[PDB]
């Protein structure tokens, strides 16, 4: 009985860490893409400037 109670107890925390870790990774991972979209948008502006020089 004490081994089952300690198993579900520690296992409950492991699941809690799994969720919060997932919710944090998905957020940080999304932020990574968001920064990439911003850099791609500004990169086009620089690309437009370079093309204007060539013209």
């Amino acid at each position: 009985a004490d081994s089952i109670n300690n198993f579900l107890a520690n296992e409950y925390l492991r699941l809690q860490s799994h969720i919060t870790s997932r919710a944090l990774n998905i957020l940080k991972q999304a932020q990574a893409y968001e920064t990439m979209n911003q850099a791609a948008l500004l990169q086009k502006l620089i690309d437009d400037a370079t093309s204007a020089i060539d013209n």
Partner: protein, 206 residues
């Protein structure tokens, strides 16, 4: 919770392992110890707190930070139901386990009957002191059964002292300095005669 909750669980497994002598039993102890360590493994990783307001402010996709929060919180509410498990394990479990539950219970009853025998003997022995101060027929009453055996030796005419005793210690004490030191042979009756005789080509059976 974390500290001191497994101390007792280590003493039990240790003794169970010490009693194991055959390699087969030692193997089962390893399997048993693994499951205990597996179930009793402690988990401490400092579950981090999420501040959705911080992420919501710095940068996030519209509706994403809120959708993650509401969905995240929903699962945090769910938790294990320790009550249901607590009952089933205590009501009945492993009908195969009942095999040794009833084996060790009868095994213990065997050695509890012996423990009571030696205990009750030492209890009755308290009133018996100085055998040399009791009369003959009173001592035989303390050791009820000797008179019955004594009648068996008499009615069968086994009146050679110590014939039916495997170790006739009384026979050795009387022969400590006897000529031709010998004790009566086991179960020797004063009437049996296994003597033989033969006639050969020579005289005197030689």
């Amino acid at each position: 919770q974390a500290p001191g909750n497994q101390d007792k669980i280590l003493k039990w497994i240790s003794t169970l392992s010490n009693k194991a002598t055959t390699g087969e039993s030692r193997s089962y102890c390893t399997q048993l110890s693994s499951l205990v360590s597996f179930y009793n493994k402690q988990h401490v990783e400092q579950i981090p707190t999420i501040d959705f307001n911080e992420w919501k402010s710095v940068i996030s996709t519209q509706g994403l930070v809120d959708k993650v929060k509401e969905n995240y919180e929903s699962l945090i509410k769910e938790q294990y139901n320790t009550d249901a498990i607590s009952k089933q394990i205590s009501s009945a479990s492993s009908k195969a386990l009942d095999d040794i539950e009833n084996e060790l219970s009868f095994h213990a009853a065997i050695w509890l009957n012996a423990y009571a025998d030696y205990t009750m003997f030492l209890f009755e022995l308290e009133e018996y002191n100085d055998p040399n101060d009791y009369l003959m027929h009173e001592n035989f009453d303390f050791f009820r059964g000797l008179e019955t055996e004594l009648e068996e030796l008499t009615e069968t005419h086994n009146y050679i002292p110590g014939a039916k005793d495997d170790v006739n210690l009384r026979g050795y004490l009387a022969t400590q300095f006897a000529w031709g030191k010998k004790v009566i042979s086991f179960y020797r009756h004063p009437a049996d005669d296994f003597k033989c005789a033969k006639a050969t080509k020579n005289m005197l059976g030689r």
